[PDB]
Every structure is written in structure tokens, then in C-alpha cells.
């Protein structure tokens, strides 16, 4: 769990205020507030670390969507190019084999 610069900065300001309040009045100011602060401070780092994983997963899976769409479109087009060349070859060479058949029949 690597701490960011922003969480370290605001924790430094919290450290400043806590040192000021320790020096100003007594020790008994901090003794119950800092465990109620440090868990929130850990939660900030945890939610930022999870959020950055969400961002990188979003980018990779998004670009995989735009890969898939155009690849499927290209593949459909080249299936079509297989599906009329079949027809043209079929009726052309069927007409030629039919003329061959009738010329060999007579």
C-alpha cells in the first residue's frame, strides 16, 4: 500500500495541528482522536489504490472493445467477399459445364 503525495500532505497538516494542540494544552487532547483519524487516513489510501486499478482496467478493456468491433466488422466483410465469389464462380462454371454437356450430347 504505497501512500500518495496528497494523503502524505494532508496527513502532514494533521500532524502540524496535532503537534500544535499537544503543545498548546496537554497530552490528553490526542489520546483518543488519533486512532479515529488514522483509520480514515488509511481508508483514503485504500480507496485511491482501488480507484487507480479501476482506471487501468477501464482503459485496457475499453481499447479491447474497439479492437473487437472493427475486427468483427472486417471479418464479416471478408465473409461476404467469400460469399459472392462463390456465386459468380458457381453460375459461370455451371453455364460452361452445361454448354459442354449439351455439345457432348449432340
Amino acid at each position: 500500500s504505497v501512500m500518495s503525495e496528497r494523503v502524505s500532505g494532508l496527513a502532514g497538516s494533521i500532524y502540524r495541528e496535532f503537534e500544535r494542540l499537544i503543545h498548546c494544552y496537554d497530552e490528553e487532547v490526542v489520546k483518543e482522536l488519533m486512532p479515529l483519524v488514522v483509520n480514515v487516513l488509511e481508508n483514503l489510501d485504500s480507496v485511491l489504490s482501488e480507484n487507480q486499478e479501476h482506471e487501468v482496467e477501464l482503459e485496457l478493456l475499453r481499447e479491447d472493445n474497439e479492437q473487437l468491433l472493427t475486427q468483427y466488422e472486417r471479418e464479416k466483410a471478408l465473409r461476404r467477399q467469400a460469399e459472392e465469389k462463390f456465386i459468380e464462380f458457381e453460375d459461370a462454371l455451371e453455364q460452361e459445364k452445361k454448354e459442354l454437356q449439351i455439345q457432348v450430347e449432340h
Partner: peptide
């Protein structure tokens, strides 16, 4: 992260 202010506290004990 917990170490920082724990040290903050143990200064005078």
C-alpha cells in the same frame, strides 16, 4: 502510517 503519530505520542514517555 500508524507509526508516525505513535511516535508523536511516545516522545515524553
Amino acid at each position: 502510517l500508524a507509526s508516525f503519530f505513535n511516535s508523536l505520542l511516545s516522545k515524553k514517555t
